[PDB]
Design an enzyme around this catalytic site. Structure first.
Site, mmCIF file in Angstrom:
data_model
loop_
_atom_site.group_PDB
_atom_site.id
_atom_site.type_symbol
_atom_site.label_atom_id
_atom_site.label_comp_id
_atom_site.label_asym_id
_atom_site.label_seq_id
_atom_site.Cartn_x
_atom_site.Cartn_y
_atom_site.Cartn_z
ATOM 1 N N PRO A 153 0.282 -6.861 -13.114
ATOM 2 C CG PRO A 153 2.415 -6.657 -14.086
ATOM 3 C CD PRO A 153 1.698 -7.249 -12.905
ATOM 4 N NE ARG A 184 -12.679 9.066 -2.208
ATOM 5 C CZ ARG A 184 -13.773 9.104 -2.966
ATOM 6 N NH1 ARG A 184 -14.115 8.056 -3.712
ATOM 7 N NH2 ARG A 184 -14.503 10.210 -3.026
HETATM 8 N N1 LIG Z 1 12.022 -10.538 -15.528
HETATM 9 C C1 LIG Z 1 10.560 -10.429 -15.711
HETATM 10 C C2 LIG Z 1 10.173 -9.000 -16.176
HETATM 11 C C3 LIG Z 1 8.632 -8.806 -16.199
HETATM 12 N N2 LIG Z 1 7.999 -9.240 -14.932
HETATM 13 C C4 LIG Z 1 6.548 -8.987 -14.944
HETATM 14 C C5 LIG Z 1 6.222 -8.259 -13.802
HETATM 15 C C6 LIG Z 1 5.698 -8.930 -12.686
HETATM 16 C C7 LIG Z 1 5.407 -8.213 -11.520
HETATM 17 C C8 LIG Z 1 5.686 -6.848 -11.450
HETATM 18 C C9 LIG Z 1 5.401 -6.149 -10.276
HETATM 19 N N3 LIG Z 1 4.152 -5.373 -10.441
HETATM 20 C C10 LIG Z 1 3.071 -5.638 -9.735
HETATM 21 O O1 LIG Z 1 3.156 -6.490 -8.844
HETATM 22 C C11 LIG Z 1 1.884 -4.973 -10.003
HETATM 23 C C12 LIG Z 1 0.799 -5.386 -9.318
HETATM 24 S S1 LIG Z 1 -0.507 -4.511 -9.804
HETATM 25 C C13 LIG Z 1 0.263 -3.629 -10.868
HETATM 26 N N4 LIG Z 1 -0.304 -2.717 -11.673
HETATM 27 C C14 LIG Z 1 0.476 -2.004 -12.597
HETATM 28 N N5 LIG Z 1 1.745 -2.321 -12.673
HETATM 29 C C15 LIG Z 1 2.325 -3.328 -11.863
HETATM 30 O O2 LIG Z 1 3.542 -3.515 -12.042
HETATM 31 C C16 LIG Z 1 1.577 -4.008 -10.951
HETATM 32 C C17 LIG Z 1 6.215 -6.190 -12.565
HETATM 33 C C18 LIG Z 1 6.497 -6.883 -13.750
HETATM 34 C C19 LIG Z 1 8.320 -10.622 -14.507
HETATM 35 C C20 LIG Z 1 9.823 -10.859 -14.423
HETATM 36 C C1 LIG Z 2 -10.701 12.657 -3.481
HETATM 37 S S1 LIG Z 2 -9.456 13.030 -4.667
HETATM 38 C C2 LIG Z 2 -10.168 14.478 -5.460
HETATM 39 C C3 LIG Z 2 -11.015 13.981 -6.652
HETATM 40 C C4 LIG Z 2 -11.935 15.065 -7.295
HETATM 41 N N1 LIG Z 2 -12.923 14.369 -8.150
HETATM 42 C C5 LIG Z 2 -11.060 16.136 -8.136
HETATM 43 O O1 LIG Z 2 -11.616 17.235 -8.381
HETATM 44 O O2 LIG Z 2 -9.908 15.808 -8.516
HETATM 45 C C6 LIG Z 2 -8.144 13.708 -3.648
HETATM 46 C C7 LIG Z 2 -6.739 13.774 -4.331
HETATM 47 O O3 LIG Z 2 -6.232 12.446 -4.585
HETATM 48 C C8 LIG Z 2 -5.445 12.431 -5.757
HETATM 49 N N2 LIG Z 2 -5.986 11.414 -6.649
HETATM 50 C C9 LIG Z 2 -7.173 10.742 -6.501
HETATM 51 N N3 LIG Z 2 -7.360 9.787 -7.381
HETATM 52 C C10 LIG Z 2 -6.224 9.845 -8.175
HETATM 53 C C11 LIG Z 2 -5.826 9.123 -9.315
HETATM 54 N N4 LIG Z 2 -6.528 8.111 -9.833
HETATM 55 N N5 LIG Z 2 -4.657 9.471 -9.900
HETATM 56 C C12 LIG Z 2 -3.931 10.456 -9.363
HETATM 57 N N6 LIG Z 2 -4.189 11.183 -8.278
HETATM 58 C C13 LIG Z 2 -5.366 10.840 -7.733
HETATM 59 C C14 LIG Z 2 -5.385 13.868 -6.296
HETATM 60 O O4 LIG Z 2 -4.156 14.483 -5.891
HETATM 61 C C15 LIG Z 2 -6.628 14.509 -5.662
HETATM 62 O O5 LIG Z 2 -6.480 15.899 -5.399
#
Ligand SMILES: NC1CCN(Cc2ccc(CNC(=O)c3csc4nc[nH]c(=O)c34)cc2)CC1
Ligand SMILES: C[S@@+](CC[C@H](N)C(=O)[O-])C[C@H]1O[C@@H](n2cnc3c(N)ncnc32)[C@H](O)[C@@H]1O
Lengths: 237, 242
Positions: free
Chosen positions: B92, B157
Site C-alpha cells: 500500500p 489482457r
Molecule cells: N500493524 C501494522 C498496520 C499497518 N500495516 C501496513 C500494511 C502492510 C501490508 C498490508 C497488506 N496489503 C498489501 O499487501 C497490499 C499490497 S498492494 C495493496 N494495495 C492496496 N492495499 C493493500 O493493502 C495492498 C496492509 C497494511 C503494517 C502492520
Molecule cells: C473488461 S472489463 C469492462 C470494461 C469496459 N471499459 C466497461 O464498459 O466497463 C470487464 C468487467 O471487469 C470489471 N472491472 C474491470 N476493471 C475493473 C476495475 N478497475 N474496478 C472494478 N471492476 C472492474 C467490471 O465488472 C467489468 O464489467
C-alpha cells in the site's frame, strides 16, 4: 446471525475460494461474522451450452452480458438476503474509486450484493434499474469484476469486530539484528517506548511526504507531527 | 512464453483463481503466459522456523523475515533464466497502479511478484532486492495476493492473442453498452444504436464517454484536455442530460 451478508453474482463462483478458504475472510466465515454466497448467472438461462452474453447493439468488438441471466441470479440472491437491507453494487472501472473512507461506509451495511461483470460489460438498463452503487478498485482495466469484488470483501471484512491514520507506515524490522552489511536502527534495539513511538511516527510522516504528499494535504498535522516531519526532511541527504 | 510471472507468496494455491479461470487461464493454456509460485515457508533456515518473527521495537503483529524471502527470490530468479526479471513488491506504500503502469509492466519479459501479509516485510529485503513497489489503491487489504492477481490479470489482457479502446485508455471512461432485447421492462435501447450509421454511433459513444467522465471523473478531463469537437459534444451532453 452474521454481521455482514455478501452475495456475489459471477460466472466463476470457484474463483471466490481465494477469499472463502484464506485469511481474515475465511476466519470471518468460520467465526460466523461473514456469510459468503455465490450466484452463477449461467444457471438462470434456458439453453444447452449455457450462454450469458449477446452481441452489442451498434456493433463493435466484444460481447455484452444480457439482462435476463443477471436479473435471475440477482432476484435469487435478493431472496436469500431475507429481511436485510441489501445494497446492490456493480464492480466497474466507471464506478466511484474505492478508498478506506468508502470501505468504512460499506462496512456499515448489513448485506451486499456484488455484481461481477465479464466481457465488454453489462447492459446499461440492468444497471439503471437494479444497481444502487458502482465502485472501482482503481484506474486500470481487468477482465472481470471477480478480483475487484474480492478486494472489496477483504477490505470490508478487516473492519468487522473480531476479524483482526491517513499516513503510510513506518519500516519494519525483524531477526537477525544484522543481515549482510545491513543493521537494524538502534532506537528499536534499546530505545524507550516514547523514543520508538517518536521514530516510527517520524519515519511514517517522512515516507508519506516522500511518496504520497497528497495524503498529507488531505490530513491535519499536529504541532508535534510538523516538527518530526521538518526534522526528517532537513536530516536526509 | 511472451510473459513469465513468478509469485512469492505463503498461499501459492490461492493463485488457482487466475491459473484455472478467465483470460489468465486461456493465456497459460495458449502458452502466452507462464505462471509459477514460490512459497517462502520452504526457504526457512530450518523446518522449525516460521516465515515471520516479532518486530524490533515491539508493537502489534509480526514481520516477514529476510532469509525465506531471499531464498524464494533467488530460486525464482534462477527459474526465470535468461529473461530480464523485474522484482515487484505489492504494497500500500507503492506507486498507485494505473492503465499507463499496466502498459509499462506488459512490456517486461519476466516479473517476480512479492506478496506479503498484513504486517509487512523487513525493510532490508526491500532496499536490497525490490525494483518497484506498486499499490492497487488507497484501501487496506490483508495481504498482497489479491493485488498480485489484479496486476497479472490487467497485464495479461494486453498480451497479443489473449482477448485497445476501453476506460482510462485515452483518459476517458467508457460509453454504456446494450444488448438484446431492443426493449426490456419499459426501457428501450438508444435509437442511434439500432438505426444509425458508423459515424452517428461513433459521435454518440464518444459523447456518452465524455459526459460520463465529466459526471464521475472530471480529474481525468483535467489531465487529458478536450479538443474543440469534444468540448461541443460535452457542452451538448451537459445541457441535454435532464
Ligand atoms: N500493524 C501494522 C498496520 C499497518 N500495516 C501496513 C500494511 C502492510 C501490508 C498490508 C497488506 N496489503 C498489501 O499487501 C497490499 C499490497 S498492494 C495493496 N494495495 C492496496 N492495499 C493493500 O493493502 C495492498 C496492509 C497494511 C503494517 C502492520
Ligand atoms: C473488461 S472489463 C469492462 C470494461 C469496459 N471499459 C466497461 O464498459 O466497463 C470487464 C468487467 O471487469 C470489471 N472491472 C474491470 N476493471 C475493473 C476495475 N478497475 N474496478 C472494478 N471492476 C472492474 C467490471 O465488472 C467489468 O464489467
Amino acid at each position: 446471525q452474521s454481521m455482514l451478508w455478501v452475495g456475489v453474482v459471477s460466472i466463476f463462483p470457484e474463483m471466490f475460494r481465494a477469499i472463502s478458504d484464506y485469511g481474515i475472510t475465511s476466519r470471518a466465515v468460520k467465526q460466523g461474522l461473514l456469510t459468503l454466497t455465490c450466484w452463477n448467472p449461467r444457471v438462470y438461462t434456458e439453453d444447452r451450452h449455457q450462454t450469458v452474453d449477446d452481441r452489442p447493439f451498434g456493433g463493435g468488438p466484444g460481447m455484452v452480458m444480457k439482462i435476463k441471466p443477471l436479473e435471475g441470479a440477482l432476484a435469487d440472491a435478493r431472496q436469500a438476503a431475507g429481511g436485510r437491507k441489501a445494497k446492490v453494487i456493480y464492480l466497474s472501472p466507471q464506478g466511484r474509486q474505492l478508498t478506506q473512507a468508502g470501505v468504512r461506509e460499506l462496512a456499515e451495511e448489513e448485506a451486499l450484493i456484488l455484481i461481477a461483470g465479464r466481457y465488454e460489460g453489462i447492459d446499461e438498463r440492468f444497471i439503471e434499474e437494479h444497481v444502487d452503487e458502482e465502485w472501482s478498485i482503481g484506474d486500470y482495466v481487468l477482465s472481470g469484476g471477480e478480483l475487484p469484488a474480492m478486494v472489496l470483501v477483504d477490505a470490508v471484512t478487516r473492519l468487522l469486530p473480531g476479524a483482526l491514520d491517513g499516513l503510510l507506515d513506518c519500516p519494519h524490522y525483524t531477526r537477525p539484528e544484522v543481515y549482510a552489511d545491513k543493521r537494524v536502527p538502534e532506537v528499536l534495539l534499546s530505545g524507550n517506548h516514547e523514543h520508538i513511538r517518536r521514530w516510527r511516527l517520524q519515519q511514517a510522516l517522512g515516507r508519506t511526504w516522500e511518496r504520497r504528499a497528497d495524503l498529507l494535504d488531505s490530513r491535519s498535522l499536529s504541532g508535534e507531527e510538523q516538527k518530526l516531519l521538518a526534522e526528517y526532511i532537513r536530516q536526509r541527504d
